[PDB]
């Protein structure tokens, strides 16, 4: 079989299935659906089991950086030491173009806690806590009821789900900063520092939040980890093309006729994706420009690209893009796209924590530099000097902001070039 | 028994775990160009200058950081590790002000030197420089805060060295500023050994303000009398006058510190 | 504000009055108890913005007393209050109106939203009415990027906006309503306008698709 | 009655200035006991 095209998820293998709210979110409504059933059975099997169907399931992070999950979970199965060990959930979510993790978080928040309870109980974590962006308001006070439920219901606290495991469930809001998404940042973040990142070594896994061992993992890894364990890893694993398995939540936004967010199968075309759940680009496939297929710390594709584009980590890869967080954004005909990109870099230049040269100096110059390829107001041969800056950013920075800073660039570099050059001849016919 | 083995540039060194890359160096007479790193406070890996290539590695590691690894291979002369350099030099020096003339700091500069040793040799860059607030920290330390380069080294130092926690970084991005935020006076019986580390002219001696150029000053060698830990500290004497007071290194003693009174 | 250095003024000193009511110290009392013992410094974000929610705006004296609170040095706080964005250094609006003008929200006109806001109260972006009842300010991505333009206003997510809408909230806040948040098109939250492509069928109740084994 | 036509997340459109803060004072009992250092803060 190993059936070549994948779409058409259909509603009984969705595991988000109340990602529209049209049902109960509290813990009555969630059992209904599946949530907190058989969840003890699930910890007496053990965290070998558990990092067990993790790992063959093939699920792969969801924050954006792609890692494999199981193996990454499996640092934390080591003896203890005199420290406690701590789950932090990554419930941020502020790369633009992402609104995926807001709606678990606020349709449900019975998901996220079973998955932190799981994910906890895999890892030896005596706690979760779960970081949720300030802005965020309604969506943390909406979690902070569930984790009251499971509390009153006996399904976390003391003797979680009555398997004589001890839990802790906190809720900690952030106060503004797309930067303490990233997993070091976020620590320093709930230990009461600015958000900076760390550099690694040490990892996380021996050092983490106040010291302790820690797992940074996404809203979305942990809300679909309970399920993974309760219908298996195979199951899972069945979706997808090879190293690419699973459901994904897919944001459509920019220029299409119904922006949504969706659940979608894994390796289904870009294209197949945005016609059928988005309602096609506005104006037609063939008003269609260039995509940027997973929020904007990937690089943009053309409309070339776009026909045959599979949305997986490793179709976009050699599509010298990113699956990232699999937000797609469309932009159609009448976009400025160099335009478009340049408040993408003025966003990290606002986003920077300034801690790393690279990116504190180089973000803040390409954003200069982009901000007069705008009006044209340049010289062609500034635009290989921008590609030069964006590669000497890229790879010497401290944390990843600065190499999602260079790569919108090299995306507008790579395949929008005549559209510059052509812009910094008005200019200099207009005013010579 | 513990120690492992290491290559920098081919060359087997013998160090012991939890030696730095940047440490290892130090051991075959290689100094790692640095800005941050200094070797009496914590590391903070924010500078990236002491970026080095290790061979068979698709990504230069940070050598006043990271532990070094055994069998690893230190390309410390290799072109991604200059590329490096010459990269993060290229952005220090992009909202440096044009002070050297009348910085203090001059002849005797970190960004100076290191630029003329590792950075490239002109500018590709064409817009307008940031500038930023003149602090007042007290009457010893003056500020020239537009020539910071963001080390934290003078932080680091109060918070650990001084036991003083009112020196930190305020705002986000290019416009982080070090300062105290209020208008505080940055009194302390160290104090004054905030203008050596800092690798720049942000940080300079008021009283020295303006009367010498490292060039033309004499060094002697000789002891501290202000009290009896007998600091070991260099006279600068210029033309039969004297010019400051500075540390010299004894590690049994001062290490490489001297107190206000001193200085 | 947009400096990030604090010159005191009679409004804005060490010694202007603050302190938390007697049931914001039980509040703070339940934060501090979420981190381990010995780690009170983790507190200072939540703390901090307990100070801004209990009084609208951190004056220097609310960072020294969370200071004196958590026991951290001072300038640890003011670091804190300068790098997160959501903290007011200076007083606001009593409704704070916060566009996102990010590329996904941008490209579905979330400049005409930005108009129409100024044309309804009379100030540019970043200033405060003469009635100190609206504060504008543009702000990065809010996380409602597939309901763009959306605009936040406080606490609550106004989505799906159009000219007309926003000069309707305003209108009702003016007024003294409260205006419902959430998306102002004819959709709920998420889902694909004028009908669904996914979860249409029944979810399956508890049980469903277990392996075996458990 | 299986409907899906209506919203039906709308609890938060009554919370308030402390709704969140309200919340956690309110599982305050629950929690387990915190682990310490052993000491009462890095400057000690
Ligand atoms: C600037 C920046 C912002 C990030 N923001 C998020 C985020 O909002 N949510 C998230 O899950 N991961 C974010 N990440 C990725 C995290 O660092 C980390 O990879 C993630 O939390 C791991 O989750 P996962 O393994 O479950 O995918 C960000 C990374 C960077 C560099
Ligand atoms: S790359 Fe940017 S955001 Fe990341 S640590 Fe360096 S300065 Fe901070
Ligand atoms: S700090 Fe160094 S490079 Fe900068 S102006 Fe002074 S002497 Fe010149
Ligand atoms: S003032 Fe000097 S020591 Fe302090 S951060 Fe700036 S350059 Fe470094
Ligand atoms: S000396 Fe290593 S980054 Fe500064
Ligand atoms: S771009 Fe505005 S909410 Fe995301
Ligand atoms: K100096």
Same mark, same amino acid.
């Given at each position: 079989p190993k059936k070549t095209s994948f779409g058409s998820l259909k509603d009984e293998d969705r595991i988000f299935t109340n990602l529209y709210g049209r049902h109960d979110?509290? &813990?009555? *409504?969630?059992?209904?659906? @599946?949530?907190?059933?058989?969840? /003890?059975?699930?910890?007496?099997?053990? +965290?070998?089991?558990?990092?067990?169907?993790?790992?063959?399931?093939? &699920?792969? *992070?969801?924050?954006?950086? @792609?890692?494999?999950?199981?193996? /990454?979970?499996?640092?934390?199965?080591? +003896?203890?030491?005199?420290?406690?060990?701590?789950?932090?959930?990554?419930?941020?979510?502020?790369?633009?173009?992402?609104?995926?993790?807001?709606?678990?978080?606020?349709?449900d928040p019975h998901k996220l806690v079973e998955g932190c309870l799981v994910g906890g109980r895999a890892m030896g974590a005596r706690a979760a806590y779960i970081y949720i962006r300030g802005e965020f308001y309604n969506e943390a006070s909406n979690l902070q009821v569930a984790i009251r439920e499971a509390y009153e219901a006996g399904l976390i606290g003391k003797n979680a789900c009555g398997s004589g495991y001890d839990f802790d469930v906190f809720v900690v809001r952030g106060a503004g900063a797309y930067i303490c998404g990233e997993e070091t940042a976020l620590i320093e973040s709930i230990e009461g520092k600015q958000g900076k990142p760390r550099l690694k070594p040490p990892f996380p896994a021996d050092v983490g939040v106040f010291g302790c061992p820690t797992t940074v993992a996404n809203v979305e890894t942990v809300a679909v980890s309970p399920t993974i364990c309760r219908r298996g890893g195979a199951w899972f694993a069945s979706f997808g093309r090879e190293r690419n398995s699973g459901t994904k939540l897919f944001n459509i936004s920019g220029h299409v006729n119904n922006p949504c967010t969706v659940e979608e199968e894994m390796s289904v075309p870009l294209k197949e994706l945005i016609e059928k759940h988005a309602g096609g680009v506005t104006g037609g496939w063939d008003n269609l420009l260039a995509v940027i297929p997973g929020g904007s710390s990937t690089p943009l594709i053309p409309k070339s690209v776009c026909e045959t584009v599979l949305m997986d980590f490793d179709a976009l890869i050699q599509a010298q893009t990113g699956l990232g967080t699999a937000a797609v954004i469309v932009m159609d005909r009448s976009t400025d796209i160099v335009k478009a990109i340049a408040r993408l870099i003025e966003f990290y230049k606002h986003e920077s924590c300034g801690q790393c040269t690279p990116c504190r100096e180089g973000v803040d110059w390409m954003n200069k530099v982009m901000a007069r390829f705008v009006r044209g107001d340049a010289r062609p041969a500034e635009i290989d000097s921008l590609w030069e800056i964006s590669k000497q950013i890229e790879g010497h920075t401290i944390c990843a902001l600065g190499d999602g800073a260079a790569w919108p660039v090299q995306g507008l570099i790579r395949h929008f070039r005549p559209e510059l050059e052509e812009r910094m001849q008005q200019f200099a016919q207009q005013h010579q | 028994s513990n120690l492992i083995e290491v290559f920098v540039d081919g060359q087997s060194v013998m160090v012991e775990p939890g030696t730095t890359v940047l440490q290892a160096c130090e051991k075959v007479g290689m100094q790692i160009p640095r800005f941050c790193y200094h070797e009496r406070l914590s590391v903070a890996g924010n500078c990236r200058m002491c970026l080095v290539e290790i061979e068979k590695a698709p990504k230069v590691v940070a050598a006043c950081a990271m532990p070094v690894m055994k069998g690893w291979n230190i390309l410390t002369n290799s072109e991604k590790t200059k590329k490096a350099r010459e990269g993060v030099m290229e952005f220090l020096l992009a909202n440096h002000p044009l002070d050297c003339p009348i910085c203090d700091q001059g002849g005797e500069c970190d960004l100076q030197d290191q630029s003329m040793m590792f950075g490239s040799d002109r500018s590709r860059f064409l817009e307008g420089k940031r500038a930023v607030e003149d602090k007042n920290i007290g009457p010893l330390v003056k500020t020239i805060m537009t020539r910071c380069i963001q080390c934290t080294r003078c932080i680091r130092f109060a918070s650990e060295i001084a036991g003083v926690d009112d020196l930190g970084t305020t705002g986000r991005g290019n416009d982080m500023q070090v300062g105290t935020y209020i208008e505080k006076m940055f009194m302390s019986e160290l104090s004054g050994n905030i203008i050596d580390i800092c690798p720049v002219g942000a940080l300079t001696s008021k009283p020295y303000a303006f009367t010498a150029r490292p060039w033309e000053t004499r060094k002697t060698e000789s002891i501290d009398v202000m009290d009896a830990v007998g600091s070991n500290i260099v006279v600068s004497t210029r033309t039969g006058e004297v010019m400051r007071i500075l540390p010299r290194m004894h590690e049994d003693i001062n290490e490489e510190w001297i107190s206000d009174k001193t200085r | 504000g947009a400096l990030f250095v604090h010159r005191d003024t009679p409004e804005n000193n060490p010694e202007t009055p603050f302190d938390f009511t007697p049931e914001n110290y039980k509040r703070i009392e339940a934060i501090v108890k979420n981190y381990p013992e010995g780690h009170k410094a983790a507190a200072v974000l939540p703390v901090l913005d307990l100070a801004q929610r209990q009084n609208?705006?951190?004056?220097?004296?609310?960072?020294?007393?969370?200071?004196?609170?958590?026991?951290?040095?001072?300038?640890?706080?003011?670091?804190?209050?300068?790098?997160?964005?959501?903290?007011?250094?200076?007083?606001?609006?009593?409704?704070?109106?916060?566009?996102?003008?990010?590329?996904?929200?941008?490209?579905?006109?979330?400049?005409?939203?930005?108009?129409?806001?100024?044309?309804?109260?009379?100030?540019?972006?970043?200033?405060?009415?003469?009635?100190?009842?609206?504060?504008?300010?543009?702000?990065?991505?809010?996380?409602?990027?597939?309901?763009?333009?959306?605009?936040?206003?406080?606490?609550?997510?106004?989505?799906?906006?159009?000219?007309?809408?926003?000069?309707?909230?305003?209108?009702?806040?003016?007024?003294?309503?409260?205006?419902?948040?959430?998306?102002?098109?004819?959709?709920?939250?998420?889902?694909?306008?004028?009908?669904?492509?996914?979860?249409?069928?029944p979810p399956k109740g508890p049980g469903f698709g277990v392996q075996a084994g458990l | 009655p299986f409907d899906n036509t209506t919203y039906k997340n709308l609890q938060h459109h009554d919370y308030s200035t402390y709704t969140f803060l309200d919340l956690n004072l309110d599982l305050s009992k629950f929690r387990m006991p915190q682990p310490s250092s052993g000491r009462e803060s890095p400057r000690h």
């Open positions: 979110w509290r &813990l009555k *409504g969630a059992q209904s659906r @599946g949530d907190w059933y058989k969840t /003890k059975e699930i910890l007496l099997k053990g +965290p070998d089991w558990i990092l067990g169907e993790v790992k063959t399931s093939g &699920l792969r *992070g969801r924050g954006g950086a @792609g890692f494999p999950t199981g193996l /990454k979970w499996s640092f934390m199965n080591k +003896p203890s030491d005199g420290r406690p060990k701590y789950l932090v959930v990554n419930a941020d979510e502020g790369e633009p173009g992402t609104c995926k993790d807001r709606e678990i978080i606020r349709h | - | 609208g705006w951190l004056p220097i004296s609310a960072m020294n007393k969370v200071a004196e609170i958590l026991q951290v040095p001072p300038m640890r706080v003011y670091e804190v209050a300068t790098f997160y964005t959501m903290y007011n250094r200076k007083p606001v609006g009593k409704y704070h109106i916060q566009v996102c003008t990010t590329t996904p929200c941008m490209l579905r006109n979330s400049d005409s939203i930005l108009e129409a806001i100024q044309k309804k109260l009379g100030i540019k972006v970043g200033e405060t009415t003469p009635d100190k009842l609206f504060t504008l300010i543009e702000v990065e991505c809010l996380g409602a990027c597939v309901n763009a333009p959306m605009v936040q206003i406080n606490d609550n997510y106004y989505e799906d906006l159009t000219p007309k809408d926003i000069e309707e909230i305003i209108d009702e806040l003016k007024a003294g309503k409260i205006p419902k948040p959430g998306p102002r098109s004819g959709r709920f939250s998420c889902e694909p306008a004028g009908g669904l492509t996914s979860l249409t069928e | -």
